[PDB]
């Protein structure tokens, strides 16, 4: 169970951080691209 | 073997996921300010 605890904490604790940082990166590239397009305009 | 690498990778990889996201948000949120200043000027 000692391993089971650490492994299930790997399952819950890491991917949950990946999903929001992925959506952050998506917003970060959206804002970068629209920044460059409208700035050039 | 499998216990050692998977358990140590849980801690090391999760720390590695933490440090980028916090720098990503800091840098890009300052970049939002730079965008809005230039755009309105």
């Amino acid at each position: 169970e000692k391993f089971k605890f650490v492994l299930d904490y790997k399952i819950k604790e890491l991917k949950k951080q990946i999903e929001p940082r992925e959506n952050e990166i998506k917003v970060m590239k959206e804002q970068i691209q629209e920044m460059e397009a409208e700035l050039e305009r | 073997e499998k216990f050692k690498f998977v358990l140590d990778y849980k801690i090391k990889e999760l720390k590695k996921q933490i440090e980028p996201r916090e720098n990503e948000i800091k840098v890009m949120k300052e970049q939002i300010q730079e965008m809005e200043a230039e755009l309105e000027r």
């Binding site: 629209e34 409208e38 305009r41 | 809005e36 755009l39 309105e40």
Partner: peptide, 16 residues
């Protein structure tokens, strides 16, 4: 334009 939409945002802020 994006700055015009920001002017919308500003206008909503004052309305608030």
């Amino acid at each position: 334009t994006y700055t015009e939409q920001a002017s919308k945002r500003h206008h909503c802020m004052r309305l608030t």
